[PDB]
Amino acid sequence: SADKSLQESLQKTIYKLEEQLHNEMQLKDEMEQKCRTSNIKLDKIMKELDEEGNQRRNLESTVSQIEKEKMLLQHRINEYQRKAEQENEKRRNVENEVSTLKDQLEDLKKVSQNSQLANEKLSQLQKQLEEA
């Protein structure tokens, strides 16, 4: 019966070993499944990382080239704004020139009517000084 003790402690050791191997097999498969999933993903993530980087660096060139074009339009704004202000001032001045000249034409017509009046009085004066 110390006999049976021995065979029973042996057989219980075997059950614990079978339980241990089965548990370790469950752990083995669970890790395998996760590891596999993660390496699928790793490979996907790497291709996509290379694609994002290339496209990011490409858009950097695009940004810089269109910022340049934007700048060059901002300067033609400045140029065309000054041109328009200046056509406006040259127009405004030619209009005042027109105004001046109309006023100079009126004053002058007045002076020359005064001079015909003047000359009419001298003509009359000359007539009254004549020696019959």
Query: Which residues from 60-99 bind its own copies, rule CB under 8 A?
Result: 60, 62-63, 66-67, 69-70, 73-74, 76-77, 80-81, 83-84, 87-88, 90-91, 94-95, 97-98
Q: Determine whether 91 is exposed, middle or buried from the number of CB atoms within 10 Å of its CB (0-12, 13-18, 19+).
A: exposed
Tokens encoding 25: 């097999």
Among 26, 30, 32, 121, binds its own copies (CB under 8 A): 32
Report the C-alpha gap between 88 and 81 in whole angstroms: 11
Q: Under the criterion CB under 8 A, does residue 21 sit at the interface with its own copies?
A: yes
Distance in Å, CB of 113 to its own copies, minimum: 9
Among 26, 30, 117, 126, binds its own copies (CB under 8 A): 126
For residue 32, CA distances in Å to 38, 44, 51, 111 come to 10, 19, 29, 116
Among 11, 117, 121, 128, binds its own copies (CB under 8 A): 11
Which x/- pattern, by CB under 8 A, does the window 101-120 give for its own copies? xx-xx--xx-xx--xx--x-
At residue 46, what is the residue type? M
Number of residues this chain uses to bind its own copies (CB under 8 A): 72
Report the C-alpha gap between 29 and 113 in whole angstroms: 123
